[PDB]
Assembly symmetry: C2
Homo-oligomer: 395 residues x 2
């Protein structure tokens, strides 16, 4: 007989409140959206981590959602549609392993470490441009967005003319209020691929195209498009989010930033605590139960859809002492900001490198940077980062 | 019996299509929104102009909305709430003239003429910053937004720290999908006033504070807040919109732009044709009939709410031959982009000067400027301007 959390991003977004309520309403909660869409969420660290590692019980892939294939839910509802896709993240077992295996090389810790000089160069160029500006600056537009999109652009083989197009596209797909986002994103990326087949390069999209051409069985056309999409979705928006979130947190905890700036504390650990404390991905659709599952005296029936509550789990007092305190010296937090199990973030080492470069460089160039104005949230209950991040670079 | 036009901006906005449908469906049409709200719209030039000039028959102000108090529409509906306010634009008669009169001085021809040096200076500084950038630039973020908000900031006495806050706040109020936008905007502006009382200055907000202090009957506290909000709503968003829309139009009509650049056509007339052709305000809530009014053989009952269709009226073939063609040489269009009658845009001369400075200066500095990427629309059925306007300055 579960508690219910009613969500509507049109009536504002409040991630801190949402995280609190999802955690408070036991580990297993019902989440009701607009339309007549109600689903489950798992929101405490221990049950969530357990579910995320047990893919025979909690499977990926919309074909497993009973109510969806039984016409009880509208397939065009944005939330029902968001992970109604054919990429690796919406697969389990051999299909996941096949697809993830094809692209893993490009994202290994060691490959990512070879990207450091170029990431430093892109970071330093951005800082140079910021130094030419004089008064209030949107950190998101100047810094947080351009850095990760440039980095993933070079890895994937994207074109600079599409960077702003992609920013809009991804926001729409993650809004959970845009019925046509997936369809428009698919047609967009299909065109990218068809342009790229004409003019190959040494980027990952070209390599995946080349891999399909060599062996059609290795990767279908639908998988090529959807996996390209997934890499685009993941590739910049969350790192962008995290840069802004991290700067907000460090400047609102000036003592901790002081430790970082004087070499008395670890940037790496601080970034892990930022990931836990203000996780850019609050929750995502879905896990689907393969059988009846009982948690805390509540049974989730076989075939039901379950939101993955990374954000509430990251504030769980069972997992962390004093969870609602930001503390960069805390024992390296084993957080779920990058998820857990088979679908643990492909890009996790790349994001960690990006943040490790971007965050100290910013404060080195602009030691007296301050937060000004308001930073209203992106209107989505799925993601947690600001629409804008106004700063003053010089006192 | 009137036709009905169903609008839902969540399912994607298309102002060109929307204007065509509104115009085509005779001058008097019903417009239905999601939830429980259906209203009227006047969408041809001649009946609209006539309504707008006749304030004893078509009054402003939500207390005149019979259906509202008859509980026939959802109150808290964003569209019902948008002009549920106490500013000059939501009043008629003595109250309108009192409130409008307090601020008119600052917007007369002679006052606006003294703003020219500063507008040119702001324009030239923005162009200097753009010249230090390299590849694709968002013209909106670099030029179209910062110019008007800086200009109105100086006139009103706003703080640069709030500029980006205001951009979001205004977008929310004009979305017509945000129930909490007016309330949050009022709270925000009430704080502005409380800050401003401490430190008065030479700007219009201070003058309105000073006016209330000297004679409380000249201006209530509610009126002070709502009118400050109104001036902020009006003060930059539409000029910003018009800059981008005008650049789109001139670069997609390169022959006409050529004539302007060689002194074979008038910038002033071109700007009037931009205003007519891609009017930034498509329609707004609410004339309310003071009696039964018959137009085109259709009676609008007393007390009913009527959308003001500036944009469809501006494409009316009865008002202009070949309305759907952009033609900077046409006789100066007598358009409704600024409205008509007692509420004719207080800022109209300021907007015309801003555009007259901004548009030629842009093309003089960046003669080979080119449109690239996508420019998706702001998601509102009320306003007509892009979310982003990617350009290459020095292709
Ligand atoms: C830096 C570039 C990034 C890329 C290219 C990227 C890409 C991906 C991909 C492809 C997956 C799916 C993995 C699989 O199915 O095996 C994934 C999962 C995930 N990523 Fe990322 N990601 C990046 C950064 C981030 C960051 C900074 C965060 C969080 C702050 C994040 C959060 C997640 C989460 C939570 C999942 C698991 C989703 C789930 O279990 O349903 N990612 N990422
Ligand atoms: C191109 C730029 C602009 C456009 C297209 C525009 C359009 C309009 C329109 C259509 C109206 C009439 C609304 C109605 O009748 O319901 C109006 C009224 C108004 N506008 Fe603007 N406007 C612009 C710029 C500005 C500026 C720069 C200001 C500066 C404060 C401003 C302040 C006002 C005010 C205060 C009113 C209400 C006047 C009254 O109630 O008497 N506008 N504008
Ligand atoms: C849908 C698909 C992938 C993501 C993602 C992966 N990594 C970051 N974000 C978010 C939403
Ligand atoms: C609501 C109220 C006023 C406006 C306006 C007036 N002038 C510019 N914008 C827009 C929307």
């Amino acid at each position: 007989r579960p508690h219910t959390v009613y969500l509507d991003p049109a009536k504002g977004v409040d991630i801190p409140a949402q995280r609190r309520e999802l955690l408070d309403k036991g580990p297993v909660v019902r989440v009701a959206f607009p339309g007549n869409l109600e689903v489950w969420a798992l929101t405490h660290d221990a049950p969530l981590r357990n579910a995320l590692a047990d893919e025979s019980v909690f499977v990926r892939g919309w074909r497993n959602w009973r109510a969806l294939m039984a016409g009880e839910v509208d397939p065009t509802h944005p939330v029902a549609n968001m992970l109604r896709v054919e990429s690796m993240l919406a697969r389990s077992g051999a299909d996941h392993k096949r697809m993830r295996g094809l692209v893993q090389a490009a994202f290994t810790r060691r490959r990512v470490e070879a990207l450091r000089p170029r990431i430093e160069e892109i970071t330093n160029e951005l800082l140079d441009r910021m130094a030419e500006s004089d008064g209030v600056v949107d950190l998101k537009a100047a810094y947080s967005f351009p850095l990760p999109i440039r980095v993933i652009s070079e890895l994937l083989g994207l074109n600079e003319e599409d960077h702003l197009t992609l920013q809009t596209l991804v926001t729409r797909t993650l809004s959970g209020t845009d019925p046509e986002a997936n369809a428009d994103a698919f047609t967009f990326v299909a065109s990218l691929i068809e342009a790229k087949r004409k003019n190959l390069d040494d980027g990952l999209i070209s390599a995946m195209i080349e891999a399909r051409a060599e062996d059609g069985d290795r990767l279908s056309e639908t998988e090529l498009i959807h996996n390209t999409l997934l890499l685009i979705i993941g590739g910049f928006e969350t790192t962008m989010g995290m840069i802004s979130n991290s700067v907000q947190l460090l400047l609102t905890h000036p003592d901790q930033l002081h430790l970082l700036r004087t070499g008395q504390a670890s940037w790496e650990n601080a970034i892990e605590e930022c990931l836990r404390f203000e996780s850019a991905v609050v929750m995502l659709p879905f896990l689907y139960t393969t059988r009846d599952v009982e948690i805390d005296g509540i049974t989730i029936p076989a075939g039901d859809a379950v939101l993955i509550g990374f954000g509430p789990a990251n504030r769980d007092p069972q997992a962390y002492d004093d969870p609602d305190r930001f503390d960069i010296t805390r024992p390296r937090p084993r957080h779920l900001a990058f998820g857990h199990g088979a679908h643990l973030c492909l890009g996790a080492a790349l994001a960690r490198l990006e943040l490790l470069i971007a965050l100290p460089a910013l404060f080195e160039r602009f030691p007296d940077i301050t937060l000004v104005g308001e930073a209203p949230p992106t209107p989505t209950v799925f993601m947690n980062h600001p629409l804008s991040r106004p700063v003053l670079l010089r006192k």
